[PDB]
């Protein structure tokens, strides 16, 4: 049950982010959410988030999709999730029907349930592969 | 267990189309299934369904695979990405496109299985 | 319906896999011929192991449809060469598993290898 809800939550989530709701997106981290985009520094809290998502933004006609792929799970000592997924960014440009593709990434995630039974993400790393 | 299930249904559903199984495929429809390949009329009916995709330049050398990723349940509304793969005979690397939108409305078979009501695919390029 | 599986097993299956392809793309190759009880042809883990033995390869799986558990995946292989963002694509594959978790055997078939 705990692998399907997971799934469901990144496909939510990735779906905001690729319809450029990026508060949505930043809704489900957690308030103080930590977000590595790249190995700049991490930002902290869903403004911090909002920012970094709308100013890699700019560069892009275009339509991201972020797919996401062999989400592996584990229990942390201090109740946490901790989630590792391939991810394959997809650039789709205006009348151009193959997209082109990259950055390949792992997303290592940290998930946290709390007293409401909904999960939220504490923080999200994102390596490139081709680095 | 819904989440499993929809993900499973469109297992066997993806697999059926891309095994140019169309009748099967337009199967996991209802009676009344509608099918809209783009903004083109949308086809009525499995046969209306199977017609569509028995005329739509390809199986001596094209083997086709339809990718989805990120299924999102509402409310049975369902959207997930799609990707399609094109695969010519004796070439390893895949030919990509279209990118895709689906948008589905699921609801409950009589046997109990699960069926779509409609399916509205567009075209991130477009 | 009467005759469909439970969804605890799908999922189950689905995080299965998603555990094994990552040893693999991690160069863990005694941990993914560690899934297997098994022939992939190989046999048995310490055959598989020496069979599989700059790039970063990822096996990304779609559409699992399972039916002993029959399980059939689409599989696309990525090439990721170091400083270069797009990888390289290819082989999509078939996977035909056949599940015991664990595996017996494993039977990858090449959607550009026609008959």
Same mark, same amino acid.
């Given at each position: 049950g705990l692998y399907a809800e997971v799934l469901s939550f990144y496909g939510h989530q990735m779906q905001?982010? !690729?319809?450029? !709701?990026?508060?949505?997106? @930043? @809704?489900?981290?957690?308030?103080?959410?930590?977000?590595?985009?790249?190995?700049?520094?991490? @930002?902290?809290?869903?403004?911090?988030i909002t920012a970094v998502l709308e100013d890699f933004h700019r560069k892009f006609k275009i339509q991201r999709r972020h797919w996401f792929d062999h989400t592996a799970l584990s229990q942390a000592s201090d109740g946490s999730i901790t989630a590792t997924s391939y991810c394959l960014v997809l650039t789709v440009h205006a009348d151009v029907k193959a997209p082109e593709f990259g950055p390949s990434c792992l997303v290592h995630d940290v998930l946290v349930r709390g007293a409401d039974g909904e999960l939220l993400l504490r923080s999200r790393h994102v390596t490139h592969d081709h680095v």
């Open positions: 905001k982010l !690729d319809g450029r !709701d990026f508060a949505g997106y @930043a @809704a489900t981290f957690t308030e103080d959410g930590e977000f590595r985009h790249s190995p700049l520094p991490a @930002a902290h809290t869903r403004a911090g």
